[PDB]
Design a protein around this ligand. Structure first.
Ligand code: A1BBS
Length: 167
């Protein structure tokens, strides 16, 4: 039993809700919140900008030190950093950016990172400015993640569309 509330069960292990991931994190304080990151951990907009803003830029400061030490992430890769005031940990996951020409097959690799964590609060990867088809991303999530994932989709119209189209 956990403290997530109001989610639609999609499968044994995948849940979805029309909500701002930042507000879900503030409410639940999950062990792991997933950030929809880029390879440079530059948290400019979307989920990343919103999470970072909610940490008063502490996420960005930590991320800049990470990159200075380790270099960029791979597309499809991830790193575990602090969750600051929002969660115990933040799993920064890089989905492919189809507008950069990046291989959509890497979306499956991106979701595989979730399997290293028993429970996660997460956004829909490669949605928004990364340009992937959100229905496909949800299908990849359900077909790839085996651990318990609570998906927060802030855009109401998108949430409604994903729920009615799921195959
Ligand atoms: O709405 C979905 C569909 C478009 C994506 C880009 C932003 N986003 C978010 N998802 C969840 N929480 C969020 N907080 C702030 C943004 C945000 C996604």
């Amino acid at each position: 039993v956990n403290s997530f509330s109001g989610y639609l069960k999609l499968t044994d292990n995948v849940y979805i809700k029309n909500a701002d991931i930042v507000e879900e994190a503030k409410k639940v304080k999950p062990t792991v919140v997933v950030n929809a990151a880029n390879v440079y951990l530059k948290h400019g907009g979307g989920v990343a900008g919103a999470l970072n803003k909610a940490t008063n830029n502490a996420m960005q400061v930590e991320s800049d030190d990470y990159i200075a030490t380790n270099g960029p992430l791979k597309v499809g890769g991830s790193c575990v950093l602090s969750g600051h005031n929002l969660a115990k940990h933040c799993l920064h996951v890089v989905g492919p950016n189809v507008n950069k020409g990046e291989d959509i097959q890497l979306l499956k690799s991106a979701y595989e990172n979730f399997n290293q964590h028993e429970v996660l609060l997460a956004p829909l990867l490669s949605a928004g400015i990364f340009g992937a088809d959100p229905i496909h991303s949800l299908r990849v999530c359900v077909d790839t993640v085996r651990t318990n994932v609570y998906l927060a989709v802030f855009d109401k119209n998108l949430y409604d569309k994903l729920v009615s189209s799921f195959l």
